[model samples]
Target: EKQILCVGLVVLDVISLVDKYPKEDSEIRCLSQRWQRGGNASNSCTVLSLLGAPCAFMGSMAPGHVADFVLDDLRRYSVDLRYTVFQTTGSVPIATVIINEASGSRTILYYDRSLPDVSATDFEKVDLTQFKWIHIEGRNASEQVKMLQRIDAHNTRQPPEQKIRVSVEVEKPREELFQLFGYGDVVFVSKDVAKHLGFQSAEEALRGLYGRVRKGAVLVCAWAEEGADALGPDGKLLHSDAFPPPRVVDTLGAGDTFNASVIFSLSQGRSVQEALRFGCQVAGKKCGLQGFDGIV
Candidate 1:
């Protein structure tokens, strides 16, 4: 199978395990703590690499101590980091948080939203046709649209078998949502995003979005513990229940893990529904682990 290319944010994560949630003007001692590299795109690429898929992560990293950590972590996972760019002035992005006592749910106190934007110039000299699968996070929606359009244009001028399979992970609705979907072969949205868009259900949102998407594209919505549901090209509704894990550690990266596994499975020729089930299994395994890359 060809490599999977991921485009989005990359950051360091500082996690603290607390016995309970902190209250206003109060502080609680943490039971444990750890730091790791994390971001929507970085985490997804790491998970895909762990699943035995060749992966490359493209994003900008700020120059600082945290940037050093991010580079080391990605190198540790053998992720292709050659395409990564670095910014000197800004601090590297980081997510700092505390986890709950029982459910492992977390409360993020600080999350950096200052990561540098990825532009068309970043990928101008590279050839995207070498990869069989491409995953785009909507953090850089404009750049993502450009990347997809360029890829689509390239494939249209190439042989049929040279076409790339594109999947997008979007957590929020944007004005370019419909236009972006028209360039994707698969689209993954969260149930929360669907609801925020005023859809009664995931199926309804998928149906509404399908009309504007490319022909034969699959629309999927991950509902976390509620499992996932997808709409087929024929407008049929397909659902997969979440796999209950034996334990719960940290729920932060489970959704990213699910998205990576699903795209990885599909790239390997698994049926859409089967791929979704495997994604649930991967997410279940993630729940039993402590961090994003722990399932590997």
Candidate 2:
């Protein structure tokens, strides 16, 4: 099986569940707590692995027990870490997440300022021919652009069937990431990102951002309970109803699950409409569960 490579951050998530968000300077007992491997790229790999997709993850990791926990979990998911970069200095990235049971909302506080992101030099060593698709987290535009350019150079020499499809997740509202806009064959725009750009709905965001993307690229957006919306290469708008579970549970990594499911479905030659529905279905299931186990 040709591998699907996810390029981004890998974090150790310390999650705590509570009935509601805490007020400033207030101490409250949490209902439950657990440690999980988390990050857009890492979570996506887990979802893809659970869905029986041959997936690999590329990111930076430091040497420590926190890193050990993350590495062990990724190994358990069968995520190929051969292309991962090892840093001699800096600490493991960590996110403290608070999940509110009442609204199924998640708030994150992340700390890893000293750890450097993956570099273009590290990415240059990767063998692009081994993967069928590459999913990139939209961060660090300088290095990311180089990596994307490398992939484009590789694709230019290969035939259509042998070319690798590029997917990018623009979750943050940063001007640097705009440099990555025209590169992706598939672009995932998050709700926060759309809202940051002053768009009210998924369809509105897609229409506004459509011209910035490549001519044949697909622009996608997910609006929580409102479901997902997309703009096809032909300028057609697509929509899928949100599939909420019977009860709300943990919502962390839900967006990553959606993106991974869409990428997985698309890789299998499924239609974009089918992929959107599959993405919503998998993400809704993830929200109802504490972790990714049994999600497939």
Candidate 3:
């Protein structure tokens, strides 16, 4: 079976559904509530697993009751957790928040102070030869640098077909963002991150990163609700407009879901444009569901 190894955070998300946005200092009641496993990497791994891809999530989990809850929730989706380490710092990361009524938008207040940093030692233990693809999340920038270095080194030792393809999903801007460009075979960036690079358009952002990215890597930028525009290695531009679902209950994990689905489809040999369309469809379907529970 083809495998995609993911490295990043694993957190328990506590989501509350509200009728509308609350005013400052005003008490508000929730219309519903849901709890589940969520995090950039965790959500992507769950979605990939649900799509029948073999996946292993590599990250840290706090050692306690909260960690147990996080693990239990991921297990329901059959995500592999052999690489989840338990640390003694703070409790597991928890994102508590409420969703908007009409727009299905969400506001998240999260706690991630206890999250452990991935180290070079962690990458040393991973057998990259076992996976076909590697998905890296931009959370622990320092750790990701070491991970990418290891991946590059491993690639040199394997046959061309056996070399792992690296993909990165950038959720936010980091000081080490530039260090990641040359390592990814496919890079997915949000419009927010692109804006930091002084590029108003996705095409312009891709052009700026083109020279820095690994040879043959594809740069993709997602503009929420507007769609995604991608720049291929050959300097060709591809765009797809978002097809909003008829109803949206929550939009929290849509981007992660879209990333996972695109990677999964690409692994199945779909064209890049086809994969993007498939991803958008999956995200639209996810938006129509309640909470992140239906991300799969």
Candidate 4:
């Protein structure tokens, strides 16, 4: 029984833990280094898996050694990927993140020139009937529209009990992607994306996004230290305070952890405010651990 499906972005992550962010022309030795699977959707899936959800992933995966590592990591985390496509080329995308050991903050440098995004054709392979929830990482706007259009059509035909819920992550700014606001049942946006979308602050961004989304859709934005804000389906405003960890460990997948926590709590029928608070705790907890291994 498929419970949740996460789509898009799986890559090799080379991480180095350090004391501080490196300055240009300055050298610093990392305290430790490790390799893991990294990507918006991938990290979220991992967190969900750790939370013991029946989670699966769907995407266009690159092939070769790096892909092997990614696959190995996913399987190790017990994230299902049977619906994922393994391409012959593009190999695997890679990201090098330098983490501030003291703060658990990270600065990433990703490389993925040959990796084209999941296409419209790729979306066709998925069976909507199989999933209860599907979360899309907002990328390849045209392709996302195609997928959402398909989901929208399917939901229109199915009864409310049979309908699938969709969530979209809008982390970047694009004219094409702006059209996705009405597509997702739950939409998650970041501070950078809010600024790019012309909002000076998170509240302003939530207000701006709330007006544009579907009447029964949610608009959520994550502010780093300011925590998270959400606009409910009825245009109600809600905020969740950030829970800073006692000792920063690794902030690599903090947002992903937050997303997974909210999704999990909401799936369990928690209220928006409850889910947001729960998500904050889960994400803060992740900041004290390495990778997605510590989520409970």
Strongest candidate by lDDT: 2
Question: TM-score per candidate, in order?
Answer: 0.93, 0.98, 0.94, 0.96
lDDT of 1 by residue, 1-296 (tens): 56788988886778888877778799778898888787887889889989999898988877767778888888888888878877655667667967886787876665565666778788775577668888888766777788888888877887877788888877766665545666688888877677877887767888776776678889898887778888878878888899867778788778889999999888888988898899999988888788765676
Per-candidate Cα RMSD to the true structure, in Å, reads 1.9, 1.0, 1.6, 1.4
For each candidate, the alpha-carbon lDDT, in order, equals: 0.80, 0.92, 0.82, 0.84
Q: TM-score ranking from best to worst?
A: 2, 4, 3, 1
Ranking by lDDT: 2, 4, 3, 1
Candidate 1 clashes between residue pairs 3 or more apart in a chain or in different chains: none
lDDT of 3 by residue, 1-296 (tens): 75799988887888888888888899988888887778888889888987889999988777777778878877887877777766767666789977887788988898766666667687788877778999998876777878888898888998888889899877687767666776788988888788987888877887777787778988888777877778887788887788788987788888898899889998888888988888888888888887445555
Better model by lDDT, 1 or 3?
Answer: 3
Strongest candidate by TM-score: 2
The residue-level lDDT of candidate 2 at 131 comes to 98
The whole-model C-alpha lDDT of candidate 1 against the native structure comes to: 0.80
Instruction: Name model 3 segments beyond 4 Å from true.
Output: 292-296
Deviating ranges (above 4 Å) for candidate 1: 173-179, 293-296
Clashing pairs in 3: none
TM-score of 3: 0.94
Task: Please write out the lDDT profile of model 4 over residues 161-279, one tens digit for every residue.
Answer: 88898888887677777778878888998888889867887799998778778778888887877888899877778999899888878888899889988888887778989988988
